[PDB]
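User: Modeling request: complex.
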Amino acid sequence: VQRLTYRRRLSYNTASNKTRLSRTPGNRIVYLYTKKVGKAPKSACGVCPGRLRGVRAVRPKVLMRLSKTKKHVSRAYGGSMCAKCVRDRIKRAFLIEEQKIVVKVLKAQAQSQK
Amino acid sequence: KGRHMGIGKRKGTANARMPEKVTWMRRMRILRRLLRRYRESKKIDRHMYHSLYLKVKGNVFKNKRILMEHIHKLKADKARKKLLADQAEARRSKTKEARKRREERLQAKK
Amino acid sequence: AKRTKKVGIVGKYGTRYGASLRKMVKKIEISQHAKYTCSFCGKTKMKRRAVGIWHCGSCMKTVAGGAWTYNTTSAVTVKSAIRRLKELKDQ
Amino acid sequence: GRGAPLAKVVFRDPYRFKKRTELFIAAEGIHTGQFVYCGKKAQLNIGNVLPVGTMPEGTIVCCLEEKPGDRGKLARASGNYATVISHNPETKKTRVKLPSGSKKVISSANRAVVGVVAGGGRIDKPILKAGRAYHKYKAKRNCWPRVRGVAMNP
Amino acid sequence: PRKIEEIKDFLLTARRKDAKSVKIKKNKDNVKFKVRCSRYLYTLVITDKEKAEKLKQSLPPGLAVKELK
RNA sequence: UGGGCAGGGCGAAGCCAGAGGAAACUCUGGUGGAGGUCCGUAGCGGUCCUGACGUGCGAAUCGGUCGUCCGACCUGGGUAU
RNA sequence: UGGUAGUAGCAAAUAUUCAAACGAGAACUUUGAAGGCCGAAGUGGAGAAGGGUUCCAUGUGAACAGCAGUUGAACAUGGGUCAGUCGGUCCUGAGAGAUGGGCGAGCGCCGUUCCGAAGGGACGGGCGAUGGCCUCCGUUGCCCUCAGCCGAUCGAAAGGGAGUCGGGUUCAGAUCCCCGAAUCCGGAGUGGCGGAGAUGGGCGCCGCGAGGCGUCCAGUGCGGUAACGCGACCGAUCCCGGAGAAGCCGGCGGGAGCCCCGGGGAGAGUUCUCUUUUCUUUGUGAAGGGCAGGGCGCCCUGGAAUGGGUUCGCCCCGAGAGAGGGGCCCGUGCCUUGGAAAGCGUCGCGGUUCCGGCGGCGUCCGGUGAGCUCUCGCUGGCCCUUGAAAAUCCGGGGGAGAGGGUGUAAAUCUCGCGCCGGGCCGUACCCAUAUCCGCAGCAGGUCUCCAAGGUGAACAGCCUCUGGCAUGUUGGAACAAUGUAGGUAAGGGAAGUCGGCAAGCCGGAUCCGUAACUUCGGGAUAAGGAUUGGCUCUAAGGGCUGGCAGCCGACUUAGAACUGGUGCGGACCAGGGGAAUCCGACUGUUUAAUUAAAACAAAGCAUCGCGAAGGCCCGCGGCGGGUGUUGACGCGAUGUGAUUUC
Ligand SMILES: [Mg+2]
Ligand SMILES: [Mg+2]
Ligand SMILES: [Mg+2]
Ligand SMILES: [Mg+2]
Ligand SMILES: [Mg+2]
Ligand SMILES: [Mg+2]
Ligand SMILES: [Mg+2]
Ligand SMILES: [Mg+2]
Ligand SMILES: [Mg+2]
Ligand SMILES: [Mg+2]
Ligand SMILES: [Mg+2]
Ligand SMILES: [Mg+2]
Ligand SMILES: [Mg+2]
Ligand SMILES: [Mg+2]
Ligand SMILES: [Mg+2]
Ligand SMILES: [Mg+2]
Ligand SMILES: [Mg+2]
Ligand SMILES: [Mg+2]
Ligand SMILES: [Mg+2]
Ligand SMILES: [Mg+2]
Ligand SMILES: [Mg+2]
Ligand SMILES: [Mg+2]
Ligand SMILES: [Mg+2]
Ligand SMILES: [Mg+2]
Ligand SMILES: [Mg+2]
Ligand SMILES: [Mg+2]
Ligand SMILES: [Mg+2]
Ligand SMILES: [Mg+2]
Ligand SMILES: [Mg+2]
Ligand SMILES: [Mg+2]
Ligand SMILES: [Mg+2]
Ligand SMILES: [Mg+2]
Ligand SMILES: [Mg+2]
Ligand SMILES: [Mg+2]
Ligand SMILES: [Mg+2]
Ligand SMILES: [Mg+2]
Ligand SMILES: [Mg+2]
Ligand SMILES: [Mg+2]
Ligand SMILES: [Mg+2]
Ligand SMILES: [Zn+2]
Ligand SMILES: [Zn+2]
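Assistant: Request completed. Predicted assembly structure:
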């Protein structure tokens, strides 16, 4: 059984120093250092725990090299807020304004009676 | 073949040699997959499947053959009970339609 | 198969800390670990996230409450008293 | 290291386009997504914070402000509250019964959060072992392993 | 690297200025054309032998052709 | 600010099934693995032989036997008194 | 400088033997053979701290390596460390530390946002100057206008931190040197090109038509009901959000690496008998494309009790369950480019040498596993513990503004390519029973990664494979006493001794059984019993395909017969037990180097002070500082010490 060593001067099993096993074309098992797994961006709703879909879950600095369409989605608040809260905000924004209009109409009727 | 495995040549407990949790989860997987195979083949209905699922979780049937034999006898007794009910319901329907036809015949007379 | 007869969740402490202390902690441990019905969703999915902090599994709504119970007698009494005070002051 | 939970409340700045965030002492009965009103004209209900000079006698408040503009320094521990007993419109001073049992006169211009502090009843549950005590005090400060003086040398 | 599946696109790639050399590797049951560019070593994989030699005759004259083996 | 701690024993809450009962509920067989829990390695420490040595391997070490070994656990580096 | 005295000693960790070579000389160097040890938590292979030439080759044997040495980590000669991608460098954590200020006789001290005029920046607009085909733009100089920040700055070779892998090469260096494939960041007048923004509609005409001229209009994309997708698809000051960025533990599932089994090949071991036998090898990088495989607290149709779906456990469901259809993320797995050219195993030729030399072949088919390690994912438990910031990057709301009037179109592009560069410092070796610290080649101490086969519960102990070593600062000859380390002892069984000190007895597993007491949790492996080997059977515990048939694959449990000199957890591993007293609740800590305890500590209990111009305390000093990012469920000062009774 082939026993292998670190290929870097860091000899501590820290978070950054995590490796995997890969077989070289020379028929040899050699450590290959793997970057930490990225995470999908979280929505700005603050209620939904599920991470956003359609966005690459890579390390934050890797987002520079990615294309624009692979970082967001074709929607309002797309890529930073889930569609569930988006449609809820749309409905709430409409309904609150409608009630405000109704309140102003009631105030107008109250002043007319006054 | 079974040699060199007697009580003398055993230093660990039976739990360590074969964990109870693993044996239990093996049985649970086998019985539950058998139950859903029967359900998808329509050999058992949804309600019987649910009741058997809970009874399996309750540690009733230790073996797959015991479970399927229990299913077979339940199906046999239920089918006969359904046969008796269908005959009685058919006879009741015959009586009800007979008196209804007699009533409508009397109304046709009047 | 009722495993014990008197001690319940407090049985994890074994024969330590004294009987009176164990029976006194048992009721509070039951209260703080049993899940309560959320007043916003109706599902019995209220868990004590931290000291005095309760969270809903489905509503995902965080409620400030008692250390070991969802709402203390002092809290509900104060809430009723304040509501009556507002009614009396504002007619 | 604090026995009382905190609530992060976000207001809209009236002088520039921004959303200010602040942390208040959580009063039990409050929840996320709730509208909390702060000011003189805010009505009397749990969660709102308004000056003492407006609230009636016998009310229950928390995070009492010792001086006008002090941001709240009195009655801000878990399960503790202050009761407003009487007012005095002349000199604008109000007597408040502190949780320690003493009554203090307070200017009627400082604010106080209505309700009791959440997280009450903590002392009711007995600490059971050194482990609970060690973890309780490690967060706060190094004062737990108190050696009695008589055990020491002179 | 890249795998070119068509033929005319490979011809355009070979005629591109970035192509410094092209090499022909013929193994059993396959013929490969590797064209070296500044970034990618494009490979064309074909099985028709007479079409492969037609391709090598149609290669631009300005590219360094290097037969392997 | 990082790293680390074999294999087993006892079996807390929670949950399932069956039996009994008017109810309250009570029993039996299961799953579950909680514990400043137990045996026991690595590690940490040093009870006894008051063993060995005692101008020594050593200005405090060595052998067997030993306490603990999921947490008031052990440990590196940075830093403060 | 003597006697001691050629004395004490050169005794911790099983062990060496034979032949040859160099050499003047060999128990000690080298080679070959044999016998051994470390036994994958190593006497192996590689790091960090530390050391600094100890690393490599040749020569010498003056001195040292407590014998000797042909040997050395000794001495003398010369070499050896190559980076955009490995780290430092960047950020900030606990902290440290200037300016303002205050104090101080004074060197200086306090203090880190506080008793501060703390901005050297900018979208845009205006004035004026320069250069280039003075078109348009760039550098500016001045003015208008806009602008928060949290404190200059230091602080990690284990925290965050974009981006290099495969093969080969040396006496010594390889993610650095050669070869081949890549990738990140920055830059760009004429953008070097292609593509997007893109080229449509209406009307008047000509032409049989296709199609061609003349006028207006639109054109910062398109698609699907949806999760969202497509190759890009303008955009400022401002604002919000995310990633960076999270504890410990348990269970389970997926994927790799290792191990195991049945075969094909190639090469070696045995063949007095047998063995279609036994041992080694039997592969593909990073970055892309495609497809498996996992996960979803994502969506669409429809709405359920006779309740249903479902895990090892759970859990979920009119706030929309089962049944279908889709959408997204990871895709480290498989195929392919890379890539068989290279590597490896064999057989054969060459250069008589100097050779990444030349050649043939093969580098194959399969199956399972509570197997071990790593990683990914799901879920749950615990906290009077809630388990870090910043640098940096991205997305979103907004339309302040820009771009052209129908084309040679433009502003603008996070799309495919192209062009150039990436500075500075370390890079050898040792890493530990001989390269470090202990005065030394000192049995002491010194932070981590990789972990095979058998037995076995096991990373226990024992034996073995890869790898390493010569028995730990000497050898030979005898086997006296007294010793140190192991044992064995007839009969008695603690009669010895302060004292069962020491030694000895039990000991694993399976089937029975288990008391006084009790805080009801325990005591408990209580106590006390029986079985254990080998061989041959029987019964039971499942998948895949088409109550049935066939084919597969594993480990177990129970029962029975036969048999051995009653031996059978046969080595190793491996608890003596009971009855009471005192003290201490217990877990834990304690006098490093004589005292590990009844001592200390601890949860529990009971007091005291303090509502902030405050209590306790520090400070020479200060509008000083710690508690305090604190407010009586808090902080500080005491006593007692589980529970019950008082
Ligand atoms: Mg780092
Ligand atoms: Mg996208
Ligand atoms: Mg069990
Ligand atoms: Mg302390
Ligand atoms: Mg003393
Ligand atoms: Mg323990
Ligand atoms: Mg002694
Ligand atoms: Mg002596
Ligand atoms: Mg123990
Ligand atoms: Mg002598
Ligand atoms: Mg020695
Ligand atoms: Mg080495
Ligand atoms: Mg050397
Ligand atoms: Mg010598
Ligand atoms: Mg390079
Ligand atoms: Mg200073
Ligand atoms: Mg710095
Ligand atoms: Mg770092
Ligand atoms: Mg590969
Ligand atoms: Mg469904
Ligand atoms: Mg080859
Ligand atoms: Mg917009
Ligand atoms: Mg090196
Ligand atoms: Mg080593
Ligand atoms: Mg030294
Ligand atoms: Mg020896
Ligand atoms: Mg020797
Ligand atoms: Mg030595
Ligand atoms: Mg005897
Ligand atoms: Mg005898
Ligand atoms: Mg005697
Ligand atoms: Mg003894
Ligand atoms: Mg006992
Ligand atoms: Mg007594
Ligand atoms: Mg004690
Ligand atoms: Mg101490
Ligand atoms: Mg001592
Ligand atoms: Mg001692
Ligand atoms: Mg006292
Ligand atoms: Zn949401
Ligand atoms: Zn809810």
